[PDB]
Design a protein around this ligand. Structure first.
Ligand SMILES: [Co+2]
Ligand SMILES: [Co+2]
Lengths: 126, 46, 46, 126, 44, 44
């Protein structure tokens, strides 16, 4: 771990757009990991922080970063119901065939969750 | 990780409580990021 | 009137299950006509 | 108990208006009691069978019949949310001060239940 | 003071309806009987 | 397949929300782990 990494994880998660930009410009570890393997992109994607999601992807964030359960930002966004974020992740090459260690792809979580709009985008993107 | 014992009167009460107990204990196997993603989805619906 | 035993891991799981167990056992003291009146009311809302 | 009484309890409960009228004309016990002390009027009031409620009251039904828990037809109707039936019972002298053996009056059950329209009629009728 | 709950799963709806019912109807029970009942739970 | 539930009581809403959550999220758990877990319940 790193100090700026921990601040960036926290800023990305709670949606502090400005603090995110400050931390990035200061060389904050864009692929920092919390105790579950979550990167800033996982947390922003999960918590529906679209502006922070775009910033992170433009500043070197791994779009297909895999947490300790093999979940990618696309898994979390698709499960959470954040359609706009799902689309942005797909544009930046998010892997729709990414299986977590329970064998779920993002579509599986969207479909199970009843996020029909996202399920459809992921199937069509297969 | 501490273990508690409940006593239940009536088969139908046992069945209901065993179902809920199982759901609460099995839910603990679900990685927190999937739990938090689910809770984001709940927040969106309500 | 038959008695079953549940084992529960975690204080918060025990608290939730004790609350529900208590509600199910205490509900049995409520005369059936009040239970059926409540169920009529539920039918009206749904 | 009586045979016609049991048929009248059942007809009143499930809302067979015609079977109720047939049974009454045949001298069915209008104050028959089921195993909880319910009369046909309790059951019709509870189950929102307004036509059967009026028929019973015109044919000698005790408006303030008390079941084994001291509940009256007004208790059940007020708890169930059957406003029209509450009003008819009140017209025929239903006792708004009737306490069941747990000390509840009809208003208490209406108010607890969130049957605000009925709660208000019962308070005003106090 | 009335909240609304969304449930996917007919089975899950029925379970939650049963518990809703028990949570609500238990309020009608006189405190003395609730207190008696809780003093009894000290079994374990 | 989505049913709606009405709950009077903020406390009752929170309890039913917790159980809703557990009933739904338990579906994600691989059958082998569910089966393992149920074979374990034979304790009593
Ligand atoms: Co059963
Ligand atoms: Co607690």
């Amino acid at each position: 771990g790193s100090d700026l990494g921990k601040k960036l994880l926290e800023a990305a998660a709670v949606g502090q757009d400005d603090e995110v930009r400050i931390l990035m410009a200061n060389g904050a570890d864009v692929n920092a990991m919390d105790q579950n393997g979550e990167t800033p992109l996982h947390l922003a994607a999960m918590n529906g922080h679209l502006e922070i999601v775009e910033v992170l992807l433009k500043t070197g964030a791994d779009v297909n970063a895999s947490d300790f359960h093999g979940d990618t930002p696309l898994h979390l966004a698709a499960m959470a119901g954040h359609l706009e974020i799902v689309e942005v992740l797909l544009k930046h090459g998010a892997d729709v065939n990414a299986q977590d260690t329970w064998g779920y792809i993002p579509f599986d979580l969207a479909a199970w969750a009843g996020n029909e709009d996202i399920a459809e985008v992921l199937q069509k993107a297969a | 990780e501490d273990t508690y014992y409940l006593q239940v009167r009536g088969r139908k009460n046992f069945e209901i409580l065993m179902k809920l107990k199982e759901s609460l204990e099995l839910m603990e196997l679900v990685p927190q990021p999937l739990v938090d993603s689910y809770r984001q989805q709940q927040q969106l619906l309500q």
